[PDB]
Amino acid sequence: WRPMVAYQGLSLGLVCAVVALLLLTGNIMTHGTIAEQQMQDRLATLREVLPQSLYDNNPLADSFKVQDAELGEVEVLPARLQGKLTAVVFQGRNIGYGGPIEQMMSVDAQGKILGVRVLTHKETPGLADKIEASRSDWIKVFDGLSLENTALDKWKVKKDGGQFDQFAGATITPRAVVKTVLQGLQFQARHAEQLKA
Amino acid sequence: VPWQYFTSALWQYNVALVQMLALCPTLAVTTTATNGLGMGLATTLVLVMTNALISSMRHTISPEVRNPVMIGVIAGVVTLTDMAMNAWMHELYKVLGLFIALIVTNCAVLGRAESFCLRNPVIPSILDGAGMGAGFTAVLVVIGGIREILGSGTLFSQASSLLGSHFKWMEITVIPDFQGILLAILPPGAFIVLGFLLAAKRVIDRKRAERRQ
Amino acid sequence: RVSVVYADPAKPLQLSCKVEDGCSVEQAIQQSGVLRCCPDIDLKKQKVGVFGKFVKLDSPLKDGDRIEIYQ
Amino acid sequence: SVAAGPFAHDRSSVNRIMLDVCLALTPATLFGLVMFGWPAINLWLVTCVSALAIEAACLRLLGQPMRRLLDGSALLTGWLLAISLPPWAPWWIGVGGSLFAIGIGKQLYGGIGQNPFNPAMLARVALLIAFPLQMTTWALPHPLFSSSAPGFFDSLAITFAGAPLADGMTGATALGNLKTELTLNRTAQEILEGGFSTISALFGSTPGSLGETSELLLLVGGVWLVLRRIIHWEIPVAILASVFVMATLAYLINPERYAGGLYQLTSGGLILCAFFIATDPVTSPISRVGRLIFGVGCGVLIYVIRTWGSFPEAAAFAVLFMNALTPLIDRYWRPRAYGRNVRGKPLVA
Amino acid sequence: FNLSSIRGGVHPAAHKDLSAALPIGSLPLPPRLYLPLRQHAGAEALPMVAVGDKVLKGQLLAFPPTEVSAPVHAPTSGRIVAIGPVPAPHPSGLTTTGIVLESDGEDRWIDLDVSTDPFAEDPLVLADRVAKAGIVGLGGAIFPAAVKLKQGTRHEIKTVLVNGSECEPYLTCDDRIMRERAEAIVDGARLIQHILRAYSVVIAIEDNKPEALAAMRAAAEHFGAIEVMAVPALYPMGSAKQLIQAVTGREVPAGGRSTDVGVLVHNAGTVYAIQQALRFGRPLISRVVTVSGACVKTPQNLDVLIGTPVQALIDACGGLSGDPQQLLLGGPMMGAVLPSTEVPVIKGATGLLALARHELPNKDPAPCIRCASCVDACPMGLTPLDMALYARADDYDGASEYGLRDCILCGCCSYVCPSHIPLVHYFQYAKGQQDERRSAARKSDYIKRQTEVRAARLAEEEAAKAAAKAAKEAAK
Amino acid sequence: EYVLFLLGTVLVHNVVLVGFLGLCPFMGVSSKLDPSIGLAVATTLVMGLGGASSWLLEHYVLLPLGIGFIRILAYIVVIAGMVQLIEMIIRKASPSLYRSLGIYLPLITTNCAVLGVPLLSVREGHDLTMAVLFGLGSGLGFSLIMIIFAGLRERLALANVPAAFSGPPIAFVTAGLLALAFMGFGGLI
Amino acid sequence: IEATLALTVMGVLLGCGLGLAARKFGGVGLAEKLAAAPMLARVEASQCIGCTRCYRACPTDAIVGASGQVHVVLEDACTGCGKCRDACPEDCVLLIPQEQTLDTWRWDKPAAA
Ligand SMILES: CCCCCCCCCCCCO[C@@H]1O[C@H](CO)[C@@H](O[C@H]2O[C@H](CO)[C@@H](O)[C@H](O)[C@H]2O)[C@H](O)[C@H]1O
Ligand SMILES: CCCCCCCCCCCCO[C@@H]1O[C@H](CO)[C@@H](O[C@H]2O[C@H](CO)[C@@H](O)[C@H](O)[C@H]2O)[C@H](O)[C@H]1O
Ligand SMILES: CCCCCCCCCCCCO[C@@H]1O[C@H](CO)[C@@H](O[C@H]2O[C@H](CO)[C@@H](O)[C@H](O)[C@H]2O)[C@H](O)[C@H]1O
Ligand SMILES: CCCCCCCCCCCCO[C@@H]1O[C@H](CO)[C@@H](O[C@H]2O[C@H](CO)[C@@H](O)[C@H](O)[C@H]2O)[C@H](O)[C@H]1O
Ligand SMILES: CCCCCCCCCCCCO[C@@H]1O[C@H](CO)[C@@H](O[C@H]2O[C@H](CO)[C@@H](O)[C@H](O)[C@H]2O)[C@H](O)[C@H]1O
Ligand SMILES: CCCCCCCCCCCCO[C@@H]1O[C@H](CO)[C@@H](O[C@H]2O[C@H](CO)[C@@H](O)[C@H](O)[C@H]2O)[C@H](O)[C@H]1O
Ligand SMILES: CCCCCCCCCCCCO[C@@H]1O[C@H](CO)[C@@H](O[C@H]2O[C@H](CO)[C@@H](O)[C@H](O)[C@H]2O)[C@H](O)[C@H]1O
Ligand SMILES: CCCCCCCCCCCCO[C@@H]1O[C@H](CO)[C@@H](O[C@H]2O[C@H](CO)[C@@H](O)[C@H](O)[C@H]2O)[C@H](O)[C@H]1O
Ligand SMILES: CCCCCCCCCCCCO[C@@H]1O[C@H](CO)[C@@H](O[C@H]2O[C@H](CO)[C@@H](O)[C@H](O)[C@H]2O)[C@H](O)[C@H]1O
Ligand SMILES: Cc1cc2nc3c(=O)[nH]c(=O)nc-3n(C[C@H](O)[C@H](O)[C@H](O)COP(=O)(O)O)c2cc1C
Ligand SMILES: Cc1cc2nc3c(=O)[nH]c(=O)nc-3n(C[C@H](O)[C@H](O)[C@H](O)CO)c2cc1C
Ligand code: SF4
Ligand code: SF4
Ligand code: SF4
Ligand code: SF4
Ligand code: FES
């Protein structure tokens, strides 16, 4: 008809109503699956630093929230086998070259590092991209170290008089990563009991 | 013949190569051939469905509010597509990110919806949408392949994790033991490749005209 | 303000001259100086016209007229 | 066909201009080559020869006369890129830089006089982005014939092929050192008191690019070019004055965080960019106010990205940005005509 | 006053020292002269004589058809043999309407109409006396002097400027004409100062003519308001628009005449011609030309009758000592390539340079490198590179925006171009295209108006006749 | 502060060179400078208004009612309506003004930038002031890039580009080199 | 539900507003487009007998003359429209291309760089 303005309003309203009904049906169909996919992605990210055998309970169910004096507030995820803490997984951030670096640590119940992975970074590709575990084994250096067998003199790059290698032509990013790891270990040492066990 | 539109839309009137449309997804999601193929497939679906809907609803659209009506008919569909590929193709959805949602404003989609779907039956509109989507997918695959070869050497990488293990046969390697030129992946490498492709298209068109003469 | 034209096929001449209002074709031609351009002009023998109409030497002319001398 | 005037000329030529620019660059290039040794010579020769060959090939493809190869517009680009590179760089760095400049930056736009961007700086930016490791490895000064620099065949192995430079032959320069030590919570004064000498940095006794090191022979060449009327003093004067003024103000405000004046001037390719690279005629304004604006913008951008940026030096980026801005400057700052006001209306008298 | 400084300009090799040594020579009467009927600007004069008539030296062969024109006088006594086509001093080589006079050789003057006490009559009388003398402004612009003087009278003139700053290379006609006839030029300047009621005359000579300056200062030292000025040695200095700025300090407004700033400019030869016409009644019959170049045996200055073939001038100066690579009618910066040596000498001919190969630069055009040496050399403050870019792309409308309107074709562009580009050639082509479009539009407007008027008058005549016939039959 | 935020939006995070948003009209109209300026002003105003309206719609209607997935639709629909009004209101009120903003307004009804900016701003959780500033900064970056590119292409139109590259391809290559030039501002803010 | 009603209200508001605005007050590719030899007559000396047909059929005042054996001739105002070609019974009009003369001479474009 395309005449009086009533047709325009009625047509737009009908279109919006039908589209909204379809969209809400699709959402009620797929929101649970989307949430499941996101949870599975989180578990897959966690599984790269925490082996299956160490933990029995669901790590993403008993999240702590601890306030320290330096880092602020943390997100310590425990890994209890039988009512006993065996590993704590948390995240650290520290300024790199192109911005803050956000990484994950998986310190066991005795202080031994079970694996460190870098989550978010904006370092220069081809010069400081070796922090990623998919390109280099450098990030796999921290795998047996602790605050016991490594005093507060080797927790630095070789440029600053430590024991950790630095990338050829890039030292700031390894400095930041090692500082984050050391701060995480010291933070675990400070908060006893709950985090230490 | 209805098949004429499907063949003619591939090269004579290319969405991203002749009409100068759909440049944002052409330049953005094209660092890998797999990303280009996925984006092209999604866009082709959306185009087919939207063309069918618009043509079936052709004699009802008020001429003065044609855009916000048809845009809606697009937008909802696009939304559904998002809520589909975020739920069962999450690996690909994480890669494309924003540009899967940015199909509503895709100039090719609205251009084909308005120009051809408002004066043609359902079958010709569906065929035209399929042809435009196929041409867009081919252009995306070509650009992504060139950029990926220049950047890493490999062609079609991690297709198994993105498009399913059934496509594992597509992971081919060119120039083994190659660190690659980093600039191809970066934004400056997209405009240059697109310009070179346009120049090559012009040259081959002139040569084909000369041969036909 | 009128013009004088010599339709000589060898050399078509056209000149523009300002004359006093109420003048005559004879005085207009004399003032225009076409006689000194071509000494072979006989004003008593050759045909004198205005816009293609044979006229008289002392016939009054209005502004915008075109006196023409031809065979 | 008739010939048109005028039938007089002042015997000028592009060949003479380009060769005089190369002659002005000659002393600094010699000083750089002697200081760094054979690898610098290898890289410089490779860059220049590859630039000439690629220019010849591109001229052949487009059908342009081969005499265009003789005006020196390609040798100059190769020379500037070679003296802009690190000394002990591999051959493929220079070859790729020459290909990316002569090619995309210059010949793809038609040839000399048609490109809108500086070719040498375009290639420098592309190389720095694509290969950051090879473009951030600075070799210490190992003078030619000094019993410590590598021999001839050792230098061949260093440049061609991939022989590692061993240890103790690579150090940090000045700007990057200052930025890193600032990231090491050390104030800007202690870093410069024990890690920078103005007298030796002015002569060119510090690590850096091939010809960038000496800020004195470059000054001599630039002054000679100015006297020969090949370039205009507006761009160099504006760039240097802007950088010096901003650096001095920053030093006077917060002396414990900013270093300015002599340190900023005698470090990086600031003088080379000011005299020889920002003064490219094809990509610089043709007016006087236009050239002043170009120079001021270049200096401001250089200082801003030097201090608060993520790069130790941004001469190339500033030059490229101002090359992008040039056409608006040309079309909005045209010189006043004769008998007309600035708006172009006829004068009234 | 005090000399200002103009903007732009070049210093080409003068080459004036090889010809400005010998005094002004003389020419034997050639057998036949070719006088084009259009030796001026504006409309072409109409012949008054027929074939076979006998004319005397000074008879008015052709008369002006309108206000802006100039007559043509017989240079010598003889018989007219043709009123037809004659070769023209043009680069094209096309012919033009003109008379051919067979020189009798007697060289008998006609009964001239001399004046009496020229400093007694009103300026209009002197202006029309100059009008009936053929004075055409022997400066290059060949604009009739009577029209310029009449336009000068209506405004207020505060200074009469004599353009004695001969600036073209190889040319020395003004130098000798001022060395030898300074008194006549001063008298002509006084006559012009009387015609245009003015304040003072400021005769200007370049500083590379010390002899001319000394002679002029010796000649004009008792008359008061007369002044002699020594302008700098710059090429585009003899131009009226630049000389006015150098002397007064003002600038002539764009699209305006020199009378706006109250200054009139006249050449040093035009002033002498005006003095001759006013004092003695002699029309413009002969002028002074300069024969120079490496291919001429003896460069010199010759008192040439108008209409003399170029070959006679070349033969007079010894002859061509070699092969002339180029023949130019004027200075090398604004000359025109002569087609042949049978071309006559019009009132606007300034020189006949015979340039060899080692005086002509070799040129190999190359793409513009935007060195901006054109902008620093243009006297009018334009941007030649942009004008060339727009003219090469046939965008004349955009070219006019960058200064193609104000260009004077002085040649300073191509003189300082590293990559040798025919900038002046581009500008001439663009101006020719613009003039052709303008002429086509003018013709279209004229023909449309003529059609409108003719149709309207025919229709009204037919309607009146029909009404009269209808009235006649009604009474029948 | 907000000046640093605006400068970072304009230079460091340019909506075209590093965002790939609104490239079709950007490449289609930048052949001439005057249409480029007109479209720049129009798109800046449109992006600011669209950002404000989208923030209001999201934080006052969608989130309180619980429907967030609808946003895309709602967003574009509202924007479309606004544009139409901003066209017709300026096609009878000020006919002279329908030569600098009205003519180019239909080009940006669906631009991918007027929609990309609100969706990006939603993920950052901006407030109303930050949303409006983000829209205005993106519009200013688009305007500046378009004007510079228009100047470059206008100069290239009179150059001796090879016949196999004259036109769009040389524009794409120039845009790539311009993005390379702008890459130096990375990390500054 | 409470959401479909709100969306329908927004839609009807937009539709009514657009309709009222239309009462009171394509494609992207096409929208971008919107934003962005003479001859002269000739009369010989024999083929004209003064039949005055050429002047009779000539909207321009090109032919001048009347009567008989007068040899009417054209002017510069001719445009080659041919209104006099068929007019002449003896076929006197001899339309020809315009010849090159000195006053109609223009400089030639330089060859190339
Ligand atoms: C056209 C003229 C423009 C003039 C521009 C003048 C403004 C720029 C200087 C003032 C801003 C200085 O900016 C200051 O420096 C650092 C880098 O040194 C910026 O950048 C920093 O933060 C950002 C974001 O986390 C990351 O890139 C990284 O962590 C670091 O580079 C910061 O955002 C700011 O603290
Ligand atoms: C004017 C410029 C002239 C250019 C002249 C080029 C001459 C040299 C040819 C290029 C180098 C060929 O040398 C190359 O060496 C490498 C290892 O060193 C080996 O090649 C290997 O690595 C290269 C690295 O890009 C790749 O091709 C590939 O991964 C593999 O083939 C081959 O041996 C040979 O491909
Ligand atoms: C895998 C290769 C893909 C190439 C992709 C990039 C496109 C390059 C092709 C177009 C390049 C233009 O570069 C060059 O342009 C000139 C225009 O003078 C064309 O023309 C040139 O060569 C032809 C012969 O083929 C001559 O007849 C002509 O006189 C000459 O100009 C060339 O054929 C082309 O090589
Ligand atoms: C003009 C041709 C092209 C010039 C540009 C390309 C030049 C490239 C040079 C190739 C160098 C190959 O790499 C270099 O090879 C030379 C032989 O030449 C080896 O040199 C070897 O032979 C020489 C004698 O000839 C011995 O003295 C030396 O001790 C031994 O090492 C080097 O150890 C190796 O570093
Ligand atoms: C315009 C100038 C062009 C500059 C070109 C420079 C090319 C330099 C090439 C050097 C050789 C390539 O690098 C080298 O490759 C080969 C393997 O392929 C090996 O080198 C070996 O073979 C090459 C030839 O193939 C010999 O010249 C060399 O003396 C020998 O050591 C080394 O493993 C690697 O160092
Ligand atoms: C981005 C603008 C410039 C574009 C430049 C054009 C591309 C130039 C080649 C880039 C290749 C990058 O990849 C580079 O390949 C070269 C071979 O060339 C490898 O080089 C390897 O082989 C060469 C010989 O061929 C040896 O001399 C060298 O010691 C060895 O490492 C490098 O280890 C790798 O870093
Ligand atoms: C034609 C132009 C002039 C051509 C000049 C040619 C000669 C130039 C030679 C200069 C290079 C040698 O000059 C100098 O040598 C010494 C070795 O003693 C190098 O290195 C040494 O001196 C520097 C100077 O502070 C100190 O860090 C240290 O004592 C040592 O490293 C210098 O970095 C270099 O500057
Ligand atoms: C506009 C053209 C260029 C002008 C010149 C540019 C010079 C370089 C910029 C200078 C900027 C200094 O930057 C500014 O320094 C002041 C110093 O007062 C710092 O201020 C800091 O120290 C001062 C004392 O000095 C304290 O009182 C203050 O509380 C503290 O914040 C600011 O945190 C910083 O923002
Ligand atoms: C270059 C052409 C333009 C010239 C413009 C000149 C305008 C400014 C003139 C006043 C400059 C004052 O310049 C002042 O000089 C001192 C030493 O005297 C310099 O200071 C210098 O020595 C101090 C220690 O003494 C060092 O820490 C510092 O790094 C070094 O630059 C600074 O650069 C500035 O603080
Ligand atoms: C490029 C150029 C060169 C000129 N060269 C001279 C010259 O050499 N001598 C001169 O007297 N006038 C020269 N003029 C000025 C005119 O030729 C002429 O003198 C002035 O316009 C009026 O003088 P006239 O009326 O006496 O001809 C030149 C003008 C221009 C534009
Ligand atoms: C004074 C001067 C400076 C120049 N600077 C450069 C430069 O920085 N980079 C370059 O590639 N060519 C440079 N050239 C060479 C020439 O300008 C270059 O070939 C044009 O950019 C080619 O388009 C310069 C030439 C001169 C005369
Ligand atoms: S003189 Fe020649 S090369 Fe220099 S700017 Fe002018 S036209 Fe270009
Ligand atoms: S010819 Fe025209 S543009 Fe060139 S210098 Fe002379 S006045 Fe200026
Ligand atoms: S129509 Fe022919 S015959 Fe008659 S007057 Fe005209 S030219 Fe003469
Ligand atoms: S062609 Fe037309 S305009 Fe020309 S003379 Fe004939 S009728 Fe007149
Ligand atoms: S502007 Fe983004 S698809 Fe056209």
mmCIF file with all atom_site columns, N, CA, C and O in Angstrom, chain E residues 40-59:
data_model
loop_
_atom_site.group_PDB
_atom_site.id
_atom_site.type_symbol
_atom_site.label_atom_id
_atom_site.label_alt_id
_atom_site.label_comp_id
_atom_site.label_asym_id
_atom_site.label_entity_id
_atom_site.label_seq_id
_atom_site.pdbx_PDB_ins_code
_atom_site.Cartn_x
_atom_site.Cartn_y
_atom_site.Cartn_z
_atom_site.occupancy
_atom_site.B_iso_or_equiv
_atom_site.pdbx_formal_charge
_atom_site.auth_seq_id
_atom_site.auth_comp_id
_atom_site.auth_asym_id
_atom_site.auth_atom_id
_atom_site.pdbx_PDB_model_num
ATOM 1  N N  . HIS E 1 40 ? 51.426 46.657 -36.502 1.00 0.00 ? 40 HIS E N  1
ATOM 2  C CA . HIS E 1 40 ? 51.043 47.225 -35.220 1.00 0.00 ? 40 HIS E CA 1
ATOM 3  C C  . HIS E 1 40 ? 50.150 46.228 -34.494 1.00 0.00 ? 40 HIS E C  1
ATOM 4  O O  . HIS E 1 40 ? 50.005 45.073 -34.905 1.00 0.00 ? 40 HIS E O  1
ATOM 5  N N  . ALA E 1 41 ? 49.552 46.684 -33.401 1.00 0.00 ? 41 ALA E N  1
ATOM 6  C CA . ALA E 1 41 ? 48.529 45.938 -32.689 1.00 0.00 ? 41 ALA E CA 1
ATOM 7  C C  . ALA E 1 41 ? 47.155 46.498 -33.029 1.00 0.00 ? 41 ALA E C  1
ATOM 8  O O  . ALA E 1 41 ? 47.000 47.683 -33.335 1.00 0.00 ? 41 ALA E O  1
ATOM 9  N N  . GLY E 1 42 ? 46.151 45.629 -32.971 1.00 0.00 ? 42 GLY E N  1
ATOM 10 C CA . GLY E 1 42 ? 44.801 46.034 -33.306 1.00 0.00 ? 42 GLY E CA 1
ATOM 11 C C  . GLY E 1 42 ? 44.443 45.775 -34.754 1.00 0.00 ? 42 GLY E C  1
ATOM 12 O O  . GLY E 1 42 ? 44.981 44.858 -35.379 1.00 0.00 ? 42 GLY E O  1
ATOM 13 N N  . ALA E 1 43 ? 43.535 46.581 -35.299 1.00 0.00 ? 43 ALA E N  1
ATOM 14 C CA . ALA E 1 43 ? 43.037 46.354 -36.646 1.00 0.00 ? 43 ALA E CA 1
ATOM 15 C C  . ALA E 1 43 ? 44.111 46.650 -37.690 1.00 0.00 ? 43 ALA E C  1
ATOM 16 O O  . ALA E 1 43 ? 45.065 47.396 -37.455 1.00 0.00 ? 43 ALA E O  1
ATOM 17 N N  . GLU E 1 44 ? 43.933 46.049 -38.862 1.00 0.00 ? 44 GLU E N  1
ATOM 18 C CA . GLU E 1 44 ? 44.863 46.196 -39.971 1.00 0.00 ? 44 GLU E CA 1
ATOM 19 C C  . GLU E 1 44 ? 44.446 47.359 -40.861 1.00 0.00 ? 44 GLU E C  1
ATOM 20 O O  . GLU E 1 44 ? 43.262 47.529 -41.166 1.00 0.00 ? 44 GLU E O  1
ATOM 21 N N  . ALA E 1 45 ? 45.425 48.157 -41.275 1.00 0.00 ? 45 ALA E N  1
ATOM 22 C CA . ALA E 1 45 ? 45.148 49.318 -42.105 1.00 0.00 ? 45 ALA E CA 1
ATOM 23 C C  . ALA E 1 45 ? 44.699 48.893 -43.501 1.00 0.00 ? 45 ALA E C  1
ATOM 24 O O  . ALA E 1 45 ? 44.980 47.785 -43.966 1.00 0.00 ? 45 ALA E O  1
ATOM 25 N N  . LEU E 1 46 ? 43.992 49.803 -44.175 1.00 0.00 ? 46 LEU E N  1
ATOM 26 C CA . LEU E 1 46 ? 43.445 49.570 -45.500 1.00 0.00 ? 46 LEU E CA 1
ATOM 27 C C  . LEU E 1 46 ? 44.194 50.386 -46.544 1.00 0.00 ? 46 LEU E C  1
ATOM 28 O O  . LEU E 1 46 ? 44.412 51.587 -46.351 1.00 0.00 ? 46 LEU E O  1
ATOM 29 N N  . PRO E 1 47 ? 44.596 49.770 -47.653 1.00 0.00 ? 47 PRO E N  1
ATOM 30 C CA . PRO E 1 47 ? 45.376 50.496 -48.659 1.00 0.00 ? 47 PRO E CA 1
ATOM 31 C C  . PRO E 1 47 ? 44.567 51.595 -49.327 1.00 0.00 ? 47 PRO E C  1
ATOM 32 O O  . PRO E 1 47 ? 43.352 51.485 -49.508 1.00 0.00 ? 47 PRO E O  1
ATOM 33 N N  . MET E 1 48 ? 45.266 52.670 -49.697 1.00 0.00 ? 48 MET E N  1
ATOM 34 C CA . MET E 1 48 ? 44.654 53.788 -50.401 1.00 0.00 ? 48 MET E CA 1
ATOM 35 C C  . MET E 1 48 ? 45.085 53.907 -51.854 1.00 0.00 ? 48 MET E C  1
ATOM 36 O O  . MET E 1 48 ? 44.423 54.614 -52.618 1.00 0.00 ? 48 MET E O  1
ATOM 37 N N  . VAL E 1 49 ? 46.164 53.242 -52.251 1.00 0.00 ? 49 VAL E N  1
ATOM 38 C CA . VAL E 1 49 ? 46.704 53.365 -53.593 1.00 0.00 ? 49 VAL E CA 1
ATOM 39 C C  . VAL E 1 49 ? 46.374 52.103 -54.384 1.00 0.00 ? 49 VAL E C  1
ATOM 40 O O  . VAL E 1 49 ? 45.902 51.103 -53.841 1.00 0.00 ? 49 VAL E O  1
ATOM 41 N N  . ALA E 1 50 ? 46.623 52.163 -55.687 1.00 0.00 ? 50 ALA E N  1
ATOM 42 C CA . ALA E 1 50 ? 46.398 51.048 -56.592 1.00 0.00 ? 50 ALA E CA 1
ATOM 43 C C  . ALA E 1 50 ? 47.719 50.624 -57.219 1.00 0.00 ? 50 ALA E C  1
ATOM 44 O O  . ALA E 1 50 ? 48.762 51.250 -57.016 1.00 0.00 ? 50 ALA E O  1
ATOM 45 N N  . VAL E 1 51 ? 47.667 49.534 -57.985 1.00 0.00 ? 51 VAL E N  1
ATOM 46 C CA . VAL E 1 51 ? 48.861 49.027 -58.646 1.00 0.00 ? 51 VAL E CA 1
ATOM 47 C C  . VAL E 1 51 ? 49.293 49.994 -59.740 1.00 0.00 ? 51 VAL E C  1
ATOM 48 O O  . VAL E 1 51 ? 48.471 50.474 -60.533 1.00 0.00 ? 51 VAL E O  1
ATOM 49 N N  . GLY E 1 52 ? 50.592 50.286 -59.787 1.00 0.00 ? 52 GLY E N  1
ATOM 50 C CA . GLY E 1 52 ? 51.148 51.154 -60.801 1.00 0.00 ? 52 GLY E CA 1
ATOM 51 C C  . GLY E 1 52 ? 51.241 52.618 -60.431 1.00 0.00 ? 52 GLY E C  1
ATOM 52 O O  . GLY E 1 52 ? 51.791 53.401 -61.217 1.00 0.00 ? 52 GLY E O  1
ATOM 53 N N  . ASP E 1 53 ? 50.729 53.016 -59.272 1.00 0.00 ? 53 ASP E N  1
ATOM 54 C CA . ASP E 1 53 ? 50.799 54.413 -58.869 1.00 0.00 ? 53 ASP E CA 1
ATOM 55 C C  . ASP E 1 53 ? 52.224 54.791 -58.483 1.00 0.00 ? 53 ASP E C  1
ATOM 56 O O  . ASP E 1 53 ? 53.028 53.948 -58.079 1.00 0.00 ? 53 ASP E O  1
ATOM 57 N N  . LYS E 1 54 ? 52.532 56.078 -58.609 1.00 0.00 ? 54 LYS E N  1
ATOM 58 C CA . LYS E 1 54 ? 53.826 56.620 -58.217 1.00 0.00 ? 54 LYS E CA 1
ATOM 59 C C  . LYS E 1 54 ? 53.669 57.327 -56.877 1.00 0.00 ? 54 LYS E C  1
ATOM 60 O O  . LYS E 1 54 ? 52.822 58.214 -56.735 1.00 0.00 ? 54 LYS E O  1
ATOM 61 N N  . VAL E 1 55 ? 54.487 56.936 -55.903 1.00 0.00 ? 55 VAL E N  1
ATOM 62 C CA . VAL E 1 55 ? 54.391 57.463 -54.549 1.00 0.00 ? 55 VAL E CA 1
ATOM 63 C C  . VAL E 1 55 ? 55.699 58.153 -54.193 1.00 0.00 ? 55 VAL E C  1
ATOM 64 O O  . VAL E 1 55 ? 56.759 57.864 -54.751 1.00 0.00 ? 55 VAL E O  1
ATOM 65 N N  . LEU E 1 56 ? 55.608 59.082 -53.248 1.00 0.00 ? 56 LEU E N  1
ATOM 66 C CA . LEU E 1 56 ? 56.758 59.822 -52.754 1.00 0.00 ? 56 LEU E CA 1
ATOM 67 C C  . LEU E 1 56 ? 57.090 59.383 -51.335 1.00 0.00 ? 56 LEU E C  1
ATOM 68 O O  . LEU E 1 56 ? 56.258 58.816 -50.624 1.00 0.00 ? 56 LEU E O  1
ATOM 69 N N  . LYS E 1 57 ? 58.328 59.657 -50.931 1.00 0.00 ? 57 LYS E N  1
ATOM 70 C CA . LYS E 1 57 ? 58.808 59.262 -49.612 1.00 0.00 ? 57 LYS E CA 1
ATOM 71 C C  . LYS E 1 57 ? 58.023 60.009 -48.542 1.00 0.00 ? 57 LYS E C  1
ATOM 72 O O  . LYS E 1 57 ? 58.215 61.213 -48.344 1.00 0.00 ? 57 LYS E O  1
ATOM 73 N N  . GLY E 1 58 ? 57.141 59.295 -47.847 1.00 0.00 ? 58 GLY E N  1
ATOM 74 C CA . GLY E 1 58 ? 56.296 59.881 -46.826 1.00 0.00 ? 58 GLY E CA 1
ATOM 75 C C  . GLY E 1 58 ? 54.816 59.856 -47.131 1.00 0.00 ? 58 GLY E C  1
ATOM 76 O O  . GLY E 1 58 ? 54.022 60.262 -46.273 1.00 0.00 ? 58 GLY E O  1
ATOM 77 N N  . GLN E 1 59 ? 54.412 59.399 -48.312 1.00 0.00 ? 59 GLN E N  1
ATOM 78 C CA . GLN E 1 59 ? 52.995 59.297 -48.627 1.00 0.00 ? 59 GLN E CA 1
ATOM 79 C C  . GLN E 1 59 ? 52.326 58.236 -47.764 1.00 0.00 ? 59 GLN E C  1
ATOM 80 O O  . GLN E 1 59 ? 52.925 57.217 -47.412 1.00 0.00 ? 59 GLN E O  1
#
